[PDB]
């Protein structure tokens, strides 16, 4: 069973630059080496086959090279629409195998999140539950911390966070943070706050509401 190893795991490159992803095969492959591109919500798509031939429909921006054990994919110029998961594949012989996959992220200027906080809807309250939602949309870089505060005091439990893949238009990220409490807990406090602390500004962006 041949084994493919890609590097790096993740790759961040500025617009226009050159993208280089590598894959090393534990055994010969003769030239059965191909590369696939997979964008979120989509199935993998054939980029390069026989290590140098671009797939019918693939733009010149892409190209692969190498020989023997390891090969590599090169994108240049890297565009806004390139962030994705890239995998190399071996078809020389059964069982066919795939590289572990490598995530390509575009690099852009910092961007502050547009923050929105939402109180629990009356419907959820009627059923004894209370989820407070906060959205941090279109920011950059991806790493950012969210802190919840109830009546001024930080809450740790009941928080679920979720990040979206990088936007393929403005190259930003978006994130959701949900603080789920019980109706009774909710009714015992009045002020709820969502705080986004980044690094591109260690000055937090806050949003909050009062139950009354």
């Amino acid at each position: 069973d041949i084994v493919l190893t890609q590097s790096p795991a993740s790759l961040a490159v500025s617009l226009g630059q050159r993208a280089t992803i590598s894959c090393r095969a534990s055994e010969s492959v003769d030239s059965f080496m191909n590369w696939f591109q997979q964008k979120p919500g989509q199935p993998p798509k054939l980029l390069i086959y026989a290590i140098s031939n671009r797939g019918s429909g693939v733009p010149a921006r892409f190209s692969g090279s190498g020989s023997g054990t390891d090969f590599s994919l090169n994108i240049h110029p890297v565009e806004e629409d390139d962030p994705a998961m890239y995998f190399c594949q071996q078809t020389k012989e059964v069982p066919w195998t795939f590289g572990g996959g490598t995530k390509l992220e575009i690099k852009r200027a910092d961007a502050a999140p547009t923050v929105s906080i939402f109180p629990p809807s009356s419907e959820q309250l009627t059923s004894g539950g209370a989820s407070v939602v906060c959205f941090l949309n279109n920011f950059y870089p991806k790493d950012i911390n969210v802190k919840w505060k109830i009546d001024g005091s930080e809450r740790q439990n009941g928080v679920l966070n979720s990040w979206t893949d990088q936007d393929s238009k403005d190259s930003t990220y978006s994130m959701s943070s949900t603080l789920t409490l019980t109706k009774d807990e909710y009714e015992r406090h009045n002020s709820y706050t969502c705080e986004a602390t980044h690094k591109t500004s260690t000055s937090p962006i806050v949003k909050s509401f009062n139950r009354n």
């Binding site: 019918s56 795939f98 996959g101 939402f118 959820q124 989820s131 949309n137 979720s162 978006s174």
Partner: protein, 212 residues
């Protein structure tokens, strides 16, 4: 254009069986070999099976050999994948793909979701999220299994939307979706998100109404 549409995905008990189908269109089916590839939650790609164009041969990897069977009906331009003796380890997104010419997987299906678990189907609870521009949202809480699709205004509202990946919250999934619109639009007009959970045949429309 070459098209491969899959169907048959679903939650099945361990040991149970499941039949996945892939409908080919846009080429001479009988002139091309076909394969199934799966992608586990860890995002890794794993070859599952292939069949000759005539169907005179078929092979599999050790992981599924003896449990999975590939079939095709060139008369109806369909590819199949019978899975028996299913395991939790088999839960993944399954894709069908066409083999070309050299030979490579140039065309893939949209993917069918398969979840092997003892947990039963649980429809979601959908709560409306009401607060230059404005951001509204929908909370899709406590459902099983994945996935759900969300739409705003039957699909009319397509831009300014952010649907976050589902997150497991105690054996149950929850996700939310946000939509940003110009103040002109809301609350002037009515905004409603459309949630669909096929597994439970659930279909709901929740209107975003201001509070008070």
């Amino acid at each position: 254009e070459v098209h491969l549409v899959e169907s048959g995905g679903d939650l099945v008990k361990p040991g149970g069986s499941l039949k996945l189908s892939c409908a080919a269109s846009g080429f001479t089916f009988s002139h091309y070999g076909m394969s199934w590839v799966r992608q586990t939650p860890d995002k890794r790609l794993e070859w599952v099976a292939t069949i000759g164009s005539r169907g005179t041969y078929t092979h599999y990897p050790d992981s599924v050999k003896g449990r999975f069977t590939i079939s095709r009906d060139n008369d109806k331009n369909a590819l199949y994948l019978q899975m028996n003796s299913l395991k939790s380890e088999d839960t993944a997104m399954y894709y069908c793909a066409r083999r070309s010419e050299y030979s490579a997987m140039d065309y893939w299906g949209q993917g069918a979701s398969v979840t092997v678990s003892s947990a039963k189907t649980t429809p979601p609870s959908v709560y409306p999220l009401a607060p230059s521009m404005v951001t509204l949202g929908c909370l899709v809480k406590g459902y099983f299994p994945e996935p759900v699709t969300v739409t705003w205004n039957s699909g009319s509202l397509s831009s300014g939307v952010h649907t976050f990946p589902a997150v497991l919250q105690s054996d149950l999934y929850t996700l939310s979706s946000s939509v940003t619109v110009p103040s002109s639009t809301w609350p002037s007009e009515t905004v409603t998100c459309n949630v669909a959970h096929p597994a439970s045949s659930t279909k709901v429309d929740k209107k975003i109404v201001p509070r008070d």
